């Protein structure tokens, strides 16, 4: 199956050519960099790029994607990207976008030994336990699973709010604001979970109120 990859280069040239066909300054626009307005934290197993889903222009989104769109406090990968987006790129928005049908969430919920994946998926099991009463009450399994996807987005938003960068910038500037959204591969629609950003911040501030 040696040919399959050499094909990726032909499809790349084709895409470049039509994009110039669609717009002559396409790669001229691309080159002069205005900072992204968004930090997007999404899932590695979601199937459509944020830029497609949202209609955002190239360079408008700075993108982190990981299994189940997690924001873990001892994960330097994501922590350093939040820090960098807020403090140095001066992003106006941070979105955590989950998606229904998420493979990572489903795999988190399977009681098996997944090696290296175990401590990663553990975070999702932690989300479940944080809402155990509500989740267990939901009879249908798929409905429960979708609710878990949603609560995970909410909890990862809470974890973004805990960051010093976010709080300092918000105090000083009133930005970035945080959004929790969920994409639905069935109808292609983005849904806003209407994450109550101000109240999350107030709850976290009870023991961590900075200037």
């Amino acid at each position: 199956l040696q040919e399959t990859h050499d094909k990726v280069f032909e499809n790349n040239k084709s895409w470049a050519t039509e994009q110039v066909a669609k717009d002559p300054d396409f790669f001229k626009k691309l080159a002069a960099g205005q900072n992204p307005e968004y930090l997007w934290i999404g899932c590695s197993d979601s199937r459509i790029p944020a830029e497609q889903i949202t209609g955002l222009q190239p360079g408008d989104a700075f993108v982190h994607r990981n299994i189940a769109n997690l924001v873990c406090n001892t994960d330097l990968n994501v922590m350093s990207v939040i820090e960098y987006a807020v403090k140095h790129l001066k992003v106006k928005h941070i979105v955590v976008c989950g998606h229904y049908g998420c493979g990572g969430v489903k795999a988190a919920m399977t009681p098996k030994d997944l090696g290296l994946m175990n401590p990663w998926l553990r975070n999702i099991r932690d989300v479940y336990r944080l809402h155990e009463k509500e989740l267990d009450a939901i009879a249908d399994e798929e409905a429960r699973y979708e609710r878990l996807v949603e609560l995970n987005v909410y909890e990862q938003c809470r974890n973004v709010v805990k960051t010093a960068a976010l709080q300092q910038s918000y105090a000083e500037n009133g930005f970035p604001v945080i959004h929790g959204w969920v994409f639905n591969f069935r109808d292609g629609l983005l849904k806003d979970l209407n994450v109550d950003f101000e109240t999350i911040l107030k709850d976290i501030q009870k023991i961590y109120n900075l200037t």
Copy 2:
């Protein structure tokens, strides 16, 4: 500037509608999941999604994006995604894609205190030191910077090869194979660094030869 975000939802519906216009089974195709053939490790500050650059179909790529497309051995985020892609998704290809003009590489090369970012960017400085003689010899700064982008891709490919998952699968199956590519925002072209995958594996195997 309260309106700007509510606009993202209108652009989402517009994108969904035209995609159905372009193809009626678009969201029907999207729903029935064939595993991705690729794991793509790219940079958070690259501006065009892999799916665009390569012409790959939605769901064909499982995507991780982080600052400067790093594969760090104590980063559970990326390690768990490599493990998951190789062992459970049975990905046929792993691509590390860097890009010229990379902000993360450039910031790594600035001698300043960037807080949380410091130990992340340190990895890139480690790449420089690994090729210090070659890099220092390059007089022009931008040329040096582009070469660093390239060597970083090569070194992160080496780090993918060190993984037990990769070696075991390759021994048993002959896949995944690893690619190191670099995107160029100036002309939109993907370039293959022609990473010599077999020899990297042999060098690493001198002290870590598994079955």
Copy 3:
């Protein structure tokens, strides 16, 4: 103050000599390695070594020490040591030992920007929030602080129980068992928090029951 360190070597020779004086086979015993019976997870700012506090013999304890004796699921340092102690050393006991007066806990509770320390100490603030009602009810600050030290030990014990290694070994072998203890620098006494190990395991098993 150049001399102060060269003194450490004289004190080392003195300690070696008296230990031979105290016992001639001291370094002969030391050399033939029986696996540790304990994994000890303690705090970097505790002042007396576990081996002293407990009367354990050298080599009896495999020791991890970090700020505030945390067991974080995305911390490969501690996760790999739990995995290694349980699976390869076949440790019979895992102890999480906190200590009153803990500087890390106190610093977690100070609302300031501590740079790199912020996401580490965040874990402790997470413990507080998990028991917010109980903790806030405690009027006296020091009493609250001691209670937090205790609850942190309990929560880090819960995090050890979530590990696949621990559960598998316990199912198969009935070991290791987990202990949560707290050292008190004021009277030198170890206190058992009497962590109910079996019930923690049952609660965690509601969504993660392995074989």
Copy 4:
């Protein structure tokens, strides 16, 4: 074997009593905290506590212990402890202490699948590759292994020097200074590897010179 642990509490009381017997203000001294003068980074599988080996007083050493005494740049555990020791405790010395016979180093050198341990031990294999020519030249295996222990200490010292905290403090204050030592369980002696601290710093500064 239910009794074995309840014994640890009797040995604790015995130790407390004799320590008061040895010195009446022992626990009074312990309570009033002068900051540690040392940050000690040692190995989890070393058998004698630093405080014993060195003759240091309780509270004089702030201690981190992990498998093979590694200082990994994406390990928040150790990075946050270096940051905290240098910036907030104002430690005068940082010691990385390895030890001959190290189980972690030996296990790193075994070509097998150790699960979660793999990416941790990979760091040690990286040290080997950095000195591959020198190490491979050493015919005797044990001699090679001891040399690897030594080079690992040297490389982890280099990694401490890369930290912003260390460089800033050293520039401003002339402290902390960094030491690389190795303990020998056979004779109980500490050996100084005489890590050339100033030159390491100069080499690292070629691309990372801060103020």
